Design a protein around this ligand. Structure first.
Ligand SMILES: CC(C)(C)NC(=O)C1=C[C@@](O)(C(=O)O)C[C@@H](O)[C@@H]1O
Ligand SMILES: CC(C)(C)NC(=O)C1=C[C@@](O)(C(=O)O)C[C@@H](O)[C@@H]1O
Ligand SMILES: CC(C)(C)NC(=O)C1=C[C@@](O)(C(=O)O)C[C@@H](O)[C@@H]1O
Ligand SMILES: CC(C)(C)NC(=O)C1=C[C@@](O)(C(=O)O)C[C@@H](O)[C@@H]1O
Ligand SMILES: CC(C)(C)NC(=O)C1=C[C@@](O)(C(=O)O)C[C@@H](O)[C@@H]1O
Ligand SMILES: CC(C)(C)NC(=O)C1=C[C@@](O)(C(=O)O)C[C@@H](O)[C@@H]1O
Ligand SMILES: CC(C)(C)NC(=O)C1=C[C@@](O)(C(=O)O)C[C@@H](O)[C@@H]1O
Ligand SMILES: CC(C)(C)NC(=O)C1=C[C@@](O)(C(=O)O)C[C@@H](O)[C@@H]1O
Ligand SMILES: CC(C)(C)NC(=O)C1=C[C@@](O)(C(=O)O)C[C@@H](O)[C@@H]1O
Ligand SMILES: CC(C)(C)NC(=O)C1=C[C@@](O)(C(=O)O)C[C@@H](O)[C@@H]1O
Ligand SMILES: CC(C)(C)NC(=O)C1=C[C@@](O)(C(=O)O)C[C@@H](O)[C@@H]1O
Lengths: 134, 135, 141, 141, 136, 136, 139, 134, 137, 137, 141, 135
């Protein structure tokens, strides 16, 4: 079982210490320990994210998805996640509820399986672990 | 190394998915020992009772996993008692509070919580425990 | 048929003071009225009052386990509690929300209820007569 | 003596529509009379899709000072004219809804009438017209 | 004259994890009461039912209440309704300034039916309120 | 310690259409001040600019303010920023209970930057504010 | 010139049977008609509870290019149809209300008519209609 | 096949540039060519409109409806239309979204099959043609 | 029979582009029309809210009617509303232009709920008509 | 007599996907129907906003009508709107689902205030009717 | 060319104890900083401060009667005064709204200006340079 | 010392389709040089291209002048990119965003921008440049 980890705009800037690279590695280590294969990609492009989403729908694979700012603004991304037949675990590194009010809304939580927020980089790992079971 | 798992109003009714509360306590207790932790699991429908327990977790500096039930959207009192905690606080909803009624999408707890796990059913707890075992 | 009538916070203070509202029937009288009417309708009616949320829920859980119907006047909780709603949403038997006053002729916040959407039905603003009428509805089913 | 029971837009389509309960307006009209009659009352039961017609009926009830049981259909949530007419009723006015309006769209959870009404019965279905009658039967003010 | 000072949720934890613990508040209220020539009873509970009970007693005893409701202030229609019954004065007391915290603390279900409200003059709101009452 | 008591629009009209009038109020306040080993300057204006002038002076002099802004309470940003400068305590006072009136009287621009707020305690509010200042 | 005075819903119920808020509809027609006489205009005063009926009278005025004094009662706060009918008028339109709408329920503070009318008189009692006439006489 | 076209309040006063009669003519001419029968009526009276809606419900015939102002106000009308088992196309001649803010809400749209706005008079004809194809 | 016609910020500027009566012409036209009705019109304008309040206070104590057009303050001043609140004689709010045919913000008046009546969009004429009303009550 | 049919994000997943007509299938009908009407139909789909804008910039430059089903971008993009606002010839907004019968947030669009018109809830055929409208200017 | 610079309430308090801040260039040093940079561009800066709305309004009128440009920092009034807005709206010559601090980084109430929609433009957050950038704009058109 | 003038969606299309984007680039450049800075001006319709450019200004600690277009009102991902700048960022708009539609009166950028200039036409760009010369 392949799991798709899709980091959205800005997450390449992670740590600018836990860099995006340290994230990618860290995820693959728990991935392989869980008897899973994680494919982690990031892009600042909404088009690109939509497309990785489309693929994972065609391939019936779960998606762990940290969309960054697009979480609060984008119906298109929501609509592409809605076709996922497999589980979708939305993730935030930071507690989105402790910050600005507009971050407390997510177009994604309603069509997602579960949501992990403010647990730091481990959100992802704990998400993989869930997807091991379903 | 104690951990407090606290469940509020109505959680005493799980299983009437099919996991009873009695069952879930056991799950957590066992899962917790596997990670070297000691889980104290408790449930009450009484908002005062949850306060005494959250008060004790403040004094002991023990971490809390809190599923507050309906109190999540409603009790500013609970929030305040919780804002006092110094060890982590992980808010947990069994169901995806975000795919239900509009009013379940506000939490009073979330802003003072370390983090929040939603929609992952019973595993939400075991995950919270795992995070506690690392940090 | 056992019918549960559950009254929330402050309801033990009926008619005795707040006598404007209200109306003038004390809680003890209301118990008697409701029992009397239950008898003519051929139902047994257990009536119970409490300012404690934990106690109301525990009565509602029991109602849910017995699949007995419920006539609930939740007091202030109507407008505020989600736990209680969540308890009530569990009942298989019918749920009738009763308010003595006309919650729509008063403060704007009384005009909203967490309970109303998950109840069979609602009676508002007919005084103590609203408990008995609700009994009537159950007698028919 | 005399209660006016009034039904606004689309209650002529009761039944029937669709169906969804099965009771027609014609049968509901007979049910209400029967029931009123069993109580010592006489029930004049009309329905109209015309707001003007409804205001004519309400005016008369006011001039005669007869009580009014109103199920105003969609008009519950939109009509300020209907409201100001009812407002001048001196006899009890009891607003009715067959279905639980708080269990539906949001625009349904506001009534222009609930505040100027004696009370409100919602979601006890057809029986809500009879229970209204029983309230009137047990008073005269 | 007996004033009733009723502290709500979390208020038993003052001083623990203002400057002043609940014990010292009690100690202070006692002296100020004796300065004023009143009797005051100070009570604290995190139970809303317990709170309602005490208010009821005041309601039947025609006695003044000083109420610091904690979070219940912003959320409880039950407590507002119990309090609206009261015939002697009710003064709502907040130790912190509520209007300088989160936006939701700026709404109180009590202010509308209280005689008045003292906000964010710290523990001295209790004393200043007992004073208002001593002068009725 | 000098204390400023500042009174905004309409407060000149107290008791002209309860009872107690502005002159009388000045005097009770003056009386309470002396009794508290304090000196009180009470003033009244219907002019926002004049009120700003008085607030500027009290910030320069680092003197305590007791402020009853009247209608400006719910409308003036300008007034709020003047008051933001005070280093000595600011106490907001309303004679009436502003939470049991029109909805728009329940928003104050001043409360958030005030030390505290006393509402609905009548004229006694001023004298509870003086007494608060009189401690620390 | 001619001036149309139009009263909507519940307005035939003026006076006693709605005490204060004090004249009957008939008496109001008498007042309005005599004041128009002196002003040198003829007033056509009609009341109806039918939104349908109001629109036709309103269409007829847009046709005749006559001015309109409208008291729409509760439809003031609810009816787009009625507003779109008045939007059509080439002569002046004066909304009238007998009571002060701003001193009652919140929902009365909004008018769908106001933005398309020439003006609005509110709370001046029955004189509203007369003051409105006076306005029209002058233009 | 029968298609009911219902014009609401104020529609008897068109002039698009065409008058209401020019409009019946036009919907009839077009209705013919698609192999349909269009009944086109107009009332300023809600009662009449609800009645015309009931008939169409009973006879299970499609409805093209331009409710005018009632679009934005009437729960009664919306409930009458909810009864229909055959399609209902809501139709506004002007672009209701390029005028006042209130015109941008409709009670009918959520219950209709679809909506056509802004295409002028010719919007009736496009509705007719959708119905040709069912 | 004295009548207070009080005008607020900016009405000094009636001029002047346009919809073409000046303030001085307004005062005079109002003073002569009030005399035709056998009243005395006392027409005063200020940009100063305090000045406006002072004149409300006097009208309160004199029990004289007030015609007020409070300009921008209509939409913003609780202070003014509260001065107006205490009048005992009639208070007619007037606006020259149709306030409802304009910015959303202009459609709320703080004075309306405590006034006797309001007249809006009737041009300079709204004044004259409020004098007529005042002659009767 | 050229007409642009632009389809925004996700629309190339038609009939894949809530099984009924695929995107290629739909390009086909539109040309079939367009020809039948004596106009030429250029039909594009893209998930990238910047690309959709390019196409809109091109249509405005060309003075050629557009028929736009913007997908999700309908409810969120101001930049899409300003692009579209530049067209001097008919724009027709089109949706396949009835946007009003779903989530509240689907019920506002940034396009409708600048579109020539809107067609909603009428399936693939909406593209066709838009086309038909356009073939009369 | 005369440019009128106008500062509303509290701007007399710049520098000390201006806070802000906590400095601090003093309203006097500002006047100096502006007439200088105005001369350099060949303009005449008439810089004024008043805590009094009626005073502000009157400076606004004369500018209108004189067709002269205005750079306005209206302080608290920005957010609250329709009177001030309407005075400014009669300006034939340009109007630039200047705020020293970044209004969008402070309280929500500061993010609304009654002045911006009738102003040529607004400069915000750039400190005391805001005024000079404003004179600059005016020196071109 | 480098200033990064960034232009967003539809801004490629100033001119007729007076100043074109071409002319605006020359103006910015002349002015910048006449002030002792070099202005790198750029346009894009692509949210992802602008983020990229922002990230680079963050890495260089170079100031940014940004006219984000309609993305001013809608993009939180853009805002977060700018939160990262340690040097000044001036938001620019040619038109008056407050004299237009209501939705244009909210900026996700304003809060994190050092400053904001609005409605001063193409000149707003050069005044922002001037601002930066003197830090
Ligand atoms: C690089 C950084 C600025 C931290 N990323 C983000 O933008 C964001 C982080 C998040 O995804 C996160 O917490 O993982 C939340 C989201 O609201 C925000 O857009
Ligand atoms: C056991 C049950 C009755 C379902 N508890 C709850 O009411 C609730 C549970 C939740 O916390 C939960 O998802 O775990 C959500 C909350 O909104 C809800 O009120
Ligand atoms: C005895 C009294 C205090 C009046 N009971 C109540 O609290 C209440 C009565 C109600 O249930 C009632 O109207 O029946 C409504 C509720 O809003 C309110 O809190
Ligand atoms: C317009 C009409 C068809 C009458 N609508 C109804 O039937 C309705 C049913 C109800 O009246 C009813 O419960 O009887 C409630 C009301 O919201 C709704 O309008
Ligand atoms: C406008 C003005 C006349 C000043 N109003 C008052 O007097 C007021 C009195 C108060 O300050 C007071 O309670 O003393 C309350 C305030 O809301 C009100 O504005
Ligand atoms: C005759 C009476 C029932 C009093 N009329 C009215 O209700 C109404 C008329 C009004 O237009 C009026 O004041 O003239 C106000 C409106 O809100 C109300 O519906
Ligand atoms: C005055 C007239 C334009 C005739 N009124 C209408 O017909 C209307 C019909 C509309 O559906 C239409 O544009 O076709 C829109 C509606 O808001 C408007 O009231
Ligand atoms: C002198 C001028 C600027 C035209 N006046 C006004 O702005 C105003 C006067 C008004 O009373 C008026 O319409 O007459 C109302 C108010 O909204 C507005 O501020
Ligand atoms: C292709 C699929 C993702 C199923 N469609 C849509 O969700 C959408 C497309 C629509 O433009 C459409 O109905 O064609 C509507 C819009 O709300 C939504 O983004
Ligand atoms: C002098 C100082 C006290 C800082 N002035 C201000 O309060 C203000 C001035 C401002 O225009 C300014 O930013 O310069 C903003 C405004 O919101 C605020 O009231
Ligand atoms: C000039 C044009 C190409 C139309 N640009 C814009 O769309 C925009 C420019 C703006 O940033 C501007 O004018 O500076 C405002 C913004 O809301 C809008 O998106």
């Amino acid at each position: 079982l392949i799991v798709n980890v899709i980091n959205g705009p800005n997450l390449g800037r992670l740590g600018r210490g836990t860099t995006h690279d340290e994230l990618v590695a860290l995820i693959e280590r728990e991935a392989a320990e869980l008897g899973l294969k994680a494919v982690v990609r990031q892009s600042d492009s909404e088009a690109q994210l939509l497309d990785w989403i489309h693929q994972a729908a065609d391939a019936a694979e779960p998606v762990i998805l940290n969309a960054g700012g697009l979480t609060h603004t984008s119906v298109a991304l929501r609509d592409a996640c809605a076709e996922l037949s497999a589980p979708l675990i939305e993730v935030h590194i930071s507690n989105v509820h402790a910050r600005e009010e507009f971050r407390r809304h997510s177009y994604l939580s309603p069509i997602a399986t579960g949501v992990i927020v403010g647990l730091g980089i481990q959100g992802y790992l704990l998400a993989l672990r869930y997807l091991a079971e379903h």
